[PDB]
């Protein structure tokens, strides 16, 4: 008897969506923003449309457009 101990640990404190505060996986739907963070594509859509900046970093992310949003 258990149960368990631990934790599937294992790794990633490296590429987690800061918006979901959750891990990503290798080849998942992701995005890169100019202040060098890597988020889910879905989460960061909603991030951008809410306000175009890396949320922690404050730097804008509307990369060289030229349009609206
Ligand atoms: Zn996410
Ligand atoms: Zn950033």
Curated annotation (Swiss-Prot):
Superkingdom? Eukaryota
- The residues that hold Zn(2+) are 17, 20, 40, 43
Start and end residues of each RING-type zinc finger?
Answer: 17-58
| Localization (cell) | Nucleus; Cytoplasm; Nucleus, PML body
Region called Ubiquitin binding, residue ranges: 32-36
The annotated crosslink position for Glycyl lysine isopeptide (Lys-Gly) (interchain with G-Cter in SUMO2) is: 2
Tissue specificity: Broadly expressed.
Quaternary structure and interacting proteins, as annotated: Monomer. Interacts with SMAD6, SMAD7, AXIN1, AXIN2 and SKIL isoform SNON. Interacts with (phosphorylated) SMAD2 and SMAD3. Part of a complex containing RNF111, AXIN1 and SMAD7. Interacts (via SIM domains) with SUMO1 and SUMO2.
Question: Briefly, what is this protein's role?
Answer: E3 ubiquitin-protein ligase. Required for mesoderm patterning during embryonic development. Acts as an enhancer of the transcriptional responses of the SMAD2/SMAD3 effectors, which are activated downstream of BMP. Acts by mediating ubiquitination and degradation of SMAD inhibitors such as SMAD7, inducing their proteasomal degradation and thereby enhancing the transcriptional activity of TGF-beta and BMP.
Read off the domain note: The SUMO interaction motifs (SIMs) mediates the binding to polysumoylated substrate.
Q: Name the family the entry cites.
A: Belongs to the Arkadia family.
What is the name listed in the Swiss-Prot or TrEMBL entry for this protein? E3 ubiquitin-protein ligase Arkadia
- Gene this chain is encoded by: RNF111
- Entire protein: shown range: 927 to 994 of 994
């Amino acid at each position: 008897m258990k149960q368990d101990g631990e934790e599937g640990t294992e790794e990633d404190t490296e590429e987690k969506c800061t918006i979901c505060l959750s891990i990503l996986e290798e080849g998942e739907d992701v995005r890169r923003l100019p202040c060098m963070h890597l988020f889910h594509q879905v989460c960061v859509d909603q991030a951008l449309i809410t306000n175009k900046k890396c949320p922690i970093c404050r730097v804008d992310i509307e990369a060289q457009l030229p349009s609206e949003s």
